[PDB]
Design a protein around this ligand. Sequence first.
Ligand code: BMP
Ligand code: BMP
Lengths: 267, 267
Amino acid sequence: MHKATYKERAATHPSPVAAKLFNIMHEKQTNLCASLDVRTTKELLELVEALGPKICLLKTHVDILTDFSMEGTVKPLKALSAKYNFLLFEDRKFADIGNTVKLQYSAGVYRIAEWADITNAHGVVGPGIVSGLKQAAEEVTKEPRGLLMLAELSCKGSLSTGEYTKGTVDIAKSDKDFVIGFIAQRDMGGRDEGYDWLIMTPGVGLDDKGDALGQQYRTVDDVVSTGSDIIIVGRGLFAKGRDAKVEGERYRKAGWEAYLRRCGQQD
Amino acid sequence: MHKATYKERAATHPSPVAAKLFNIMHEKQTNLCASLDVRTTKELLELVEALGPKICLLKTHVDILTDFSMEGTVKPLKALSAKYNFLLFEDRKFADIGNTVKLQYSAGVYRIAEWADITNAHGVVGPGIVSGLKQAAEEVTKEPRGLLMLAELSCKGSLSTGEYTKGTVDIAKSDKDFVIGFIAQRDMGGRDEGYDWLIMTPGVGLDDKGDALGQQYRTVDDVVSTGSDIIIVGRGLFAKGRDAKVEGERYRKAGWEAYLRRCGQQD
Ligand SMILES: O=c1cc(O)n([C@@H]2O[C@H](COP(=O)(O)O)[C@@H](O)[C@H]2O)c(=O)[nH]1
Ligand SMILES: O=c1cc(O)n([C@@H]2O[C@H](COP(=O)(O)O)[C@@H](O)[C@H]2O)c(=O)[nH]1
C-alpha cells in the first residue's frame, strides 16, 4: 500500500505541477505545506519569508486579506516562491456553475488563475467545474495549472461522506493532467486505474486539539501513515504566540521522518 | 401543499430579513430576484438601476467584479437598495472551516457581512459553518443578517443529491432566526416542524435552455409550481442583447402570476 518515493513520482506524474512539487519535496526534504492564514499582507509575507525554506507548498486564502493587491501581495509572493522554491496554492474552493467559477477564477480582483500554480474545487457542482476552471486558466495563462478536489474535510460535521466523496473522486478521474489529486484525510486509491493522486491533508497539529468553530487536528504521524503526501498546517505554525520559524522546521522534520518511515513499509 | 401568501408569512416569519423580503414582494408584487452577473461596477449599477423597481432582491457576485470597491460598489448598491426597495444577497457560497469562513465573510476586501442582508453556504462543511458565519456577522454589525443553505444546484452533474441535500437541510434547522431557507430547485418541506423555509431557485429562464458550461434552465411557471418563492434570473434578463428593463417587467410579471395561480391551489 505504501507509495513510491517522491523523486520517483516526479518522473512518473503526468502533471508538470505535481512533478515539480514532488521534486521540491525531494530537493528540500519536506512534505509540509504552510497555510499562513493572516489578515494582512505584511505579516503574510513575513511568515512566508520565515517558512520559505522549510515548505514545499504555500496554501493561501487571499480573500481573508484586508489589504490585497496584485502588486503588494501577488508580486511579492511570486518572488518568495521563486526565491525559496515552493509552489502557490490558492485555497479558494470554487463551488458554483462552470460559468460563474470561470470568472471568479480567471479574473475578478484576485485574478487567481494568473499566479496560483494550484487551486481546488468542491465536488458538489458536478464535473463541469473541472472544465470551467481548466478553460478559465488556459484563457489567461500558458503556465501549468493543477486542480485538487475536496474529497473529505477535517471539521466536525463534514458532509463529504462516502457517497459525496465518491462522486467527487469521480470528477477527478476526468482529467489526469489537470487534476493532481485531492484534499482528503486519507489515501483515495486510484493507483489501480493509473492515477498518482496527490493527497494533501489539512487539520494537522502536534499541539492543538482544535475546534473553537469546528476544527479538529490529527498528528503529523497520524495523517501520514493514513497515506498523506503533504501536511497542511496553519495555526499550528504561527498562532498562539508560536514561532513560525521553529514550528516550520519542527513540523517539516516530523513530517519527513513519518514519510521515510512509511516508505520502509511493505504492508 | 400550497403556501400562505407573502403578506402572511411576513407577519409569521421569525427572521426580520425574511419578513421584510416577504413585505417587499407583496408591496411591489415581485418574487423576482435579479442576478446581474457582469464584470464591472459601472454596468452592474446600470442594470440595477433598470431592474430596481421590478425586483425584491438583488443577488450579487462581487468577486466577479474587476473593479470592486467599498465606496464605488457597495455604497451605490446600498443606495439603490434603499431607493428602489429590495434586499442585497451576496451569493458567495461559503464553504470552508468555520474559522476560515468567519474571516472571509466579515472582513477581507469585500467585507460582505457589512452590507449583504443575505448570503449562503454549502452544507458540505458541517453545521459549524452556520455558527461561523452567524458569529462573523454579529461581530461586525448590529444589522439583521440571513443565511440561505444550498440544498440543490441547477447545473448538470450536481452532487447536491438526496443524502447531501438531507444533511444540508439539517444544518438549516439549527437556527430558525438566522437560516431563512434554501437555494433549491424544489420545496424543501419543514412546515410540519414550524419552518417557513424561503425557497429561492436559480437556473430560471423563459428563453435559454442553458449550458455552455453546465447550466440548465427551467421556466418561471415550471419552478414556481415546484414551490419556489423567489426566481433568480441572470443572463435571461441582461445577456444575449436583451433589454434588462423589458425582461425585468416580463419575468417579474410571469413570476407573480405563476404565484397567484399556485395560491388558488388547494391540492
Ligand atoms: O478539510 C479541510 C479543508 C481545508 O482546505 N482546511 C483549511 O486548512 C487551513 C489551515 O488550518 P489550520 O489553521 O486549522 O491549521 C485553513 O485555511 C482551512 O480553511 C481545513 O482545515 N479542513
Ligand atoms: O444551483 C445554483 C446556485 C446558484 O447560486 N446559481 C447562480 O445563479 C446565477 C444566475 O444564473 P444565470 O445567469 O444562468 O441565470 C449565477 O450567478 C450562479 O452562480 C445557479 O445558477 N445555480
